[PDB]
From a paper:
Caspases comprise two classes: the initiator caspases, such as caspase-8 and -9, and the effector caspases, such as caspases-3 and -7. For example, the autoactivation of caspase-9 is mediated by the assembly of a heptameric complex involving Apaf-1 and cytochrome c, dubbed the apoptosome. Supporting this hypothesis, caspase-9 exists predominantly as a monomer in solution and exhibits a basal level of catalytic activity.
In agreement with this analysis, previous structural investigation showed that Phe404 and Phe404′, one of the five residues on strands β6 and β6′, respectively, appear to impede the dimerization of caspase-9 by way of their incompatible side-chain configuration at the interface. To generate a potentially dimeric caspase-9, we replaced five residues in the β6 strand of caspase-9 (Gly402-Cys-Phe-Asn-Phe406) with those in caspase-3 (Cys264-Ile-Val-Ser-Met268), using standard mutagenesis methods. The structure was determined at 2.8 Å. First, the dimeric caspase-9 exists as an asymmetric homodimer in an identical manner to the WT caspase-9. This observation also indicates that Phe404 is not a contributing reason for the observed asymmetry in caspase-9 as previously suggested, as Phe404 is replaced by Val in the dimeric caspase-9. The only significant structural difference occurs at the solvent-exposed surface loops L2, L4, L2′, and L4′. Thus we conclude that the impact of the five-residue replacement is naturally absorbed without any significant structural rearrangement, and that the dimeric caspase-9 faithfully mimics the dimerized state of the WT caspase-9.
Numbering used by the authors:
A (entry chain A): 140 to 287, 335 to 416
B (entry chain B): 140 to 289, 335 to 416
The structure:
């Protein structure tokens, strides 16, 4: 009875009642220009599709964008924020690309464009601020990253691993993070909230191989997020 | 019981068997040099006292060090990391003082020393890394910062950076921090049955509802499990 009385408590949980839930934008970068020096990302496509599928399961509108340049990425993001989220309860943004640690004020890390030009996670998040995007005002804004005064609110960012470090793959079973995220979400998204799920993910992904991969979270959420399912 | 299971699941929750739970250092900068320009964080003595009884009640060997310089803070910290938390289950660091925002590579944030010189959160978190302190390896390492004004793989680190101005009594800048007061109350009511992350969400919501043209505590986590504090 408690679980149903919490999930329904609007002061402790973000009520995800609309159908569909919101937009989910997956940006998939695999092929990098020669000058950058970034190795082709084998398997990123199997990951992409797992996620596309998963968030669809979770009732989102998923659009994928493959191989985009720094300038095109920021253009998709501005486009997304430019939308009318009025009738939506949430918004998701996934970025499957190469990355690194970047100097920041609020949100760490940067992600590479197919052109090798970086984009700060921080710049990505803010594109979704209340001024530029009042439709998502007050609503949870999630950010999933598989890499290497408009006060920011309800911003959630998960990192395949603390920026600067290594994310371990396996072109066939998929990268640990995306695979584990898909699995755990499959298992529990119906009875468990976003932060609990990411705990299982982090813990799970933490027991593989020599080098330990360590999924991150940088949150400014006010309530627990329970994904809609079926 | 669902919660009962949750609490006792070693895979889903950092089990706290020992007693005490660990060390807790609260640095409390109240009086800053005049050149700093930074005002006297009065009322902070009330905040600090509330927090030391809170973490005390949470089973920690709390130690309070007030008015430290950027260097003495780094020293006070360096010390805590030289200890052998080996038999302990978790470590806590609370920092009350003025803070300044600055671009950084690893972690965001910085707190002001009594001298007026900044100490980046990056450096604070790093001081407790696996190497410099294996004693706390794999164990939960908590950092609560309340600062108005704003290959050692990182693991089991948790940083709560609040910058919520606002007193317990708005008419009196010396009544204490509304954030602290609010967090403390939240702990008094749910610690006995809600994990760290859940407690702080309650707090986050209370803050957002309290003020609007104000930010909200930013959390950064590398925890692998839930943390149910010891409460007797």
């Amino acid at each position: 009875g408690a679980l149903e009385s919490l999930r329904g408590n609007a002061d402790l949980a973000y009520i995800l009642s609309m159908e569909p839930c919101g937009h989910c934008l997956i940006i998939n970068n695999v092929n990098f220009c020669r000058e950058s020096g970034l190795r082709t990302r084998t398997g990123s496509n199997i990951d992409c599709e797992k996620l596309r599928r998963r968030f669809s399961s979770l009732h989102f509108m998923v659009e994928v964008k493959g191989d985009l340049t720094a300038k095109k990425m920021v253009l998709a993001l501005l486009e997304l924020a430019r939308q009318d989220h009025g009738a939506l309860d949430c918004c998701v943004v996934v970025i499957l690309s190469h990355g690194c640690q970047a100097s920041h004020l609020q949100f760490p890390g940067a992600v590479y464009g197919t052109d090798g030009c970086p984009v700060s996670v921080e710049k990505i998040v803010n594109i979704f601020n209340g001024t530029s995007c009042p439709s998502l005002g007050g609503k949870p804004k999630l950010f999933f990253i598989q890499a290497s005064l408009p006060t920011p609110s309800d911003i959630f960012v998960s990192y395949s691993t603390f920026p600067g470090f290594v994310s371990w793959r396996d072109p066939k079973s998929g990268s640990w993070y995306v695979e584990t995220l898909d699995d755990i979400f499959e298992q529990w998204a119906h009875s468990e909230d976003l932060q609990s799920l990411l705990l299982r993910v982090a813990n799970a992904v933490s027991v593989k191989g020599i080098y330990k991969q360590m999924p991150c979270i940088v949150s400014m959420l006010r309530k627990k997020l329970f994904f809609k399912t079926s």
